[PDB]
Design an enzyme around this catalytic site. Structure first.
Site, PDB file in Angstrom:
ATOM      1  N   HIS A  14      45.949  34.531  31.629  1.00 44.23           N
ATOM      2  CA  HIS A  14      47.044  33.836  30.968  1.00 44.23           C
ATOM      3  C   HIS A  14      46.637  32.418  30.561  1.00 44.23           C
ATOM      4  CE1 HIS A  14      47.972  31.350  34.564  1.00 44.23           C
ATOM      5  NE2 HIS A  14      47.504  32.407  35.209  1.00 44.23           N
ATOM      6  N   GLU A 172      57.044  31.746  42.135  1.00 49.86           N
ATOM      7  CA  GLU A 172      57.192  32.753  41.086  1.00 49.86           C
ATOM      8  C   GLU A 172      58.083  33.934  41.461  1.00 49.86           C
ATOM      9  OE1 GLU A 172      54.290  34.699  38.800  1.00 49.86           O
ATOM     10  OE2 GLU A 172      52.785  33.124  39.214  1.00 49.86           O
ATOM     11  N   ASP A 228      43.539  39.469  42.544  1.00 49.45           N
ATOM     12  CA  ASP A 228      44.347  38.378  43.102  1.00 49.45           C
ATOM     13  C   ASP A 228      45.455  39.034  43.925  1.00 49.45           C
ATOM     14  OD1 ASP A 228      46.619  39.038  41.400  1.00 49.45           O
ATOM     15  OD2 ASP A 228      45.585  37.999  39.760  1.00 49.45           O
ATOM     16  N   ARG A 498      63.288  12.691  34.372  1.00 44.51           N
ATOM     17  CA  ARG A 498      61.862  12.961  34.110  1.00 44.51           C
ATOM     18  C   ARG A 498      61.420  12.218  32.840  1.00 44.51           C
ATOM     19  NH1 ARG A 498      61.841  18.438  32.405  1.00 44.51           N
ATOM     20  NH2 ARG A 498      64.000  17.957  31.812  1.00 44.51           N
TER      21      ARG A 498
HETATM   22  N1  LIG Z   1      57.815  23.709  38.038  1.00 43.00           N
HETATM   23  C1  LIG Z   1      57.099  24.442  38.933  1.00 43.00           C
HETATM   24  N2  LIG Z   1      57.367  24.404  40.254  1.00 43.00           N
HETATM   25  C2  LIG Z   1      56.662  25.124  41.140  1.00 43.00           C
HETATM   26  N3  LIG Z   1      55.646  25.941  40.794  1.00 43.00           N
HETATM   27  C3  LIG Z   1      55.279  26.075  39.504  1.00 43.00           C
HETATM   28  C4  LIG Z   1      56.002  25.313  38.480  1.00 43.00           C
HETATM   29  N4  LIG Z   1      55.448  25.622  37.292  1.00 43.00           N
HETATM   30  C5  LIG Z   1      54.442  26.507  37.539  1.00 43.00           C
HETATM   31  N5  LIG Z   1      54.343  26.775  38.863  1.00 43.00           N
HETATM   32  C6  LIG Z   1      53.382  27.703  39.513  1.00 43.00           C
HETATM   33  O1  LIG Z   1      52.100  27.746  38.888  1.00 43.00           O
HETATM   34  C7  LIG Z   1      51.501  28.977  39.306  1.00 43.00           C
HETATM   35  C8  LIG Z   1      50.312  29.368  38.440  1.00 43.00           C
HETATM   36  O2  LIG Z   1      49.441  28.247  38.310  1.00 43.00           O
HETATM   37  P1  LIG Z   1      48.186  28.290  37.302  1.00 43.00           P
HETATM   38  O3  LIG Z   1      47.131  27.406  37.946  1.00 43.00           O
HETATM   39  O4  LIG Z   1      48.739  28.023  35.916  1.00 43.00           O
HETATM   40  O5  LIG Z   1      47.743  29.861  37.261  1.00 43.00           O
HETATM   41  P2  LIG Z   1      46.801  30.677  38.300  1.00 43.00           P
HETATM   42  O6  LIG Z   1      47.454  30.497  39.645  1.00 43.00           O
HETATM   43  O7  LIG Z   1      46.852  32.098  37.775  1.00 43.00           O
HETATM   44  O8  LIG Z   1      45.420  30.058  38.209  1.00 43.00           O
HETATM   45  C9  LIG Z   1      52.632  29.989  39.268  1.00 43.00           C
HETATM   46  O9  LIG Z   1      52.491  30.930  40.346  1.00 43.00           O
HETATM   47  C10 LIG Z   1      53.885  29.129  39.386  1.00 43.00           C
HETATM   48  O10 LIG Z   1      54.656  29.434  40.547  1.00 43.00           O
END
Ligand SMILES: Nc1ncnc2c1ncn2[C@@H]1O[C@H](COP(=O)(O)OP(=O)(O)O)[C@@H](O)[C@H]1O
Ligand SMILES: [Fe+2]
Ligand SMILES: [K+]
EC number: 6.1.2.2
Length: 566
Positions: A14, A172, A228, A498
């Protein structure tokens, strides 16, 4: 050095993006979704983003010193899929397809460890010599948290936590469970504000001074049929939530709506019903992260904190960290999610090559910009009538001041989830009705969602109670008494907001617009929300903005030097 960082792979990924560092500086940087118009940049190399970067910089792959990827991809293939089948050239052919990117020879290809890549995107661009690094996301290759130390060019990992205890995943799943959707945690953050915390342990987390402990799942638990622990953590959390929480999962509903003429998605329940579960998932997250932050800071004896990883988008958690006793200075880049690990991998590589990484500089306008000629073409294609106002900023400020909503598409598009005055929908920060108007009438979205203000940095000092740069709308803070009640649409009951602070350097045109606004309504402050329709990415091209301007009851569109009305 010229280093092209990349993120996005055709299989199970993603937020593809591409970032070009040239001699320490960011030549170009963009998220694939902006070009494809498909949200989230799923299952693909960043073909178009990389295409745009090279074009911007006036380069071919042959001018590249290195291509870097933001995961140890061969290592994930070896571990989880039993075999890394590709040669560095077969790898580059997937990442930079030969029909878009012609090369005489392959450049050196580096795979950078996922969290290191996050850590790189925070440290090397912060403008600070050293600090504590806290990487918190869903899950890199194995770990879900990294505590590291940033000193004199080096990042050193102290400890990590394994994927099954992810707080990203945790958040999530709650997000999904509420009917908000796993791909909308931000909405969950938003909902939290309306909830009331009951038992921040959720009967799963045990908190402590170094972080947290998750007795619900085996920390060494692992998925055989994957790479994962998402599906694993999902079953565990969903089962757990239904035991302890008074409502079952909100389910999604697929029905043909004869008014839309399509089968549309919807939620069996109103997600607002889960506000308590939201308030509590937020509190759990804050409490876990407060512990980790404290831990990594005390081990490094640092007082500047670097945060990255998806969870670093939690502006509410960030704001509370900031006011923390253990934190003096704190940097979270706008691209804390995976979209940042392109930039992160490039930086880590540039640094290995002896390059010196320049600070972002309170801006994220690294995407595409367009000539007035190019814009003109997009307008002339549509046959709409338009003006070239002598003083666009003054007229734009007058429209806002008077309570009209203005589409603002100027300069290089901003990178990351939050609009920052390059591709924004703007309205009155001062209006007691603006919020319900934009939420309900303009964007057709949930009444409980909040809005963020843009203000001149030169008055940031008197508006917020923290005299600090807040360039990215990724950190909450409190407004001062004198401004608490003046800005009804951008300050919560809480008095929190914010904010985006703006400097003349970062955005001369916008800074100039806010200033004009000042003379109209006293404060150079305005509402600033993402420029897009419900199911699209922020708009990118002038065509993109006309299209959206077309189906939103906006008043006017300032695209380039041009103003368009309704
Ligand atoms: N506003 C937010 N508050 C808490 N968690 C968040 C928020 N926005 C995104 N996330 C978390 O970011 C996670 C994914 O982070 P990312 O580093 O983009 O992908 P990956 O974990 O696949 O490497 C998601 O599981 C989501 O819960
Ligand atoms: Fe990540
Ligand atoms: K402080």
């Amino acid at each position: 050095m010229r280093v092209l960082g990349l993120n996005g792979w055709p299989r199970d990924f993603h937020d593809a993006s591409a970032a070009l560092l040239v001699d320490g500086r960011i030549a170009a940087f963009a998220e694939e979704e902006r070009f494809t118009r498909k949200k989230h940049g799923y299952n693909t190399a960043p073909v178009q983003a990389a295409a745009f970067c090279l074009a911007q910089a006036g380069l071919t792959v042959d001018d590249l010193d290195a291509v870097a990827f933001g995961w140890d991809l061969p290592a994930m293939y070896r571990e989880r899929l039993g075999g890394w089948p590709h040669s560095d050239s077969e790898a580059l052919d997937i990442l930079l397809p030969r029909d878009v990117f012609p090369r005489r020879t392959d450049p050196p290809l580096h795979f950078v460890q996922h969290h290191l890549a996050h850590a790189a995107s925070a440290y090397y661009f912060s403008g600070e010599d050293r600090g504590a690094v806290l990487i918190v996301d869903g899950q890199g290759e194995e770990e879900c948290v990294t505590l590291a130390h940033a000193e004199g060019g080096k990042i050193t990992v102290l400890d990590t936590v394994p994927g099954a205890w992810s707080l990203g995943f945790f958040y999530e799943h709650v997000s999904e469970y509420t009917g908000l959707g796993g791909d909308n945690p931000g909405k969950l953050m938003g909902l939290a504000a309306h909830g009331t915390t009951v038992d921040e342990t959720l009967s799963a987390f045990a908190f402590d001074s170094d972080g947290y402990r998750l007795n619900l799942i085996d920390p060494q638990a692992r998925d055989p049929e994957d790479w994962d622990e998402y599906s694993v953590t999902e079953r565990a959390w969903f089962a757990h939530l239904e035991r302890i929480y008074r409502l079952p999962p909100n389910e999604f509903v697929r029905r043909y709506d004869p008014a839309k003429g399509r089968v549309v998605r919807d939620t069996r329940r109103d997600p607002y019903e889960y506000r308590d579960l939201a308030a509590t998932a937020q509190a759990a997250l804050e409490r876990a992260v407060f512990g980790l932050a404290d831990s990594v800071l005390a081990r490094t004896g640092e007082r500047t904190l670097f945060v990255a990883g998806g969870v670093g988008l939690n502006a509410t958690m960030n704001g509370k960290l900031l006011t923390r006793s253990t934190v003096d200075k704190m940097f979270v880049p706008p691209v804390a999610s995976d979209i940042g690990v392109s930039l992160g991998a490039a930086a880590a590589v540039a640094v290995e090559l002896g390059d010196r990484i320049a600070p972002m500089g309170d801006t994220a306008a690294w995407g595409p910009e367009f000539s007035p000629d190019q814009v003109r073409a997009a307008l002339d294609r549509t046959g709409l009538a338009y003006r070239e106002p002598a003083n666009l900023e003054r007229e734009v400020a007058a429209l806002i001041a008077s309570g009209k909503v203005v589409g603002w598409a100027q300069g290089r598009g901003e990178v990351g989830p939050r609009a920052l005055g390059q591709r924004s929908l703007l309205g009155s920060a001062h209006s007691p009705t603006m919020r319900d108007h934009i939420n309900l009438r303009v964007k057709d979205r949930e009444w409980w969602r909040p809005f963020a203000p843009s203000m001149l940095r030169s008055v940031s000092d008197q508006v917020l109670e923290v005299d600090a740069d807040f360039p990215y709308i990724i950190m909450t803070t409190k407004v001062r008494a004198a401004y608490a009640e003046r800005l009804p649409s951008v300050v919560h009951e809480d008095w929190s907001t914010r904010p985006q602070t703006v400097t003349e350097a970062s955005n001369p045109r916008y800074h100039r617009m806010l200033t004009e606004l000042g003379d109209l309504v006293g404060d150079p402050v305005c509402l600033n929300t993402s420029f897009n329709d419900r199911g699209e990415p922020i708009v990118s091209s002038p065509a993109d903005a006309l299209l959206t301007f077309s189906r939103l009851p906006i008043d006017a569109l300032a695209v380039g030097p041009y103003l368009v009305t309704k």
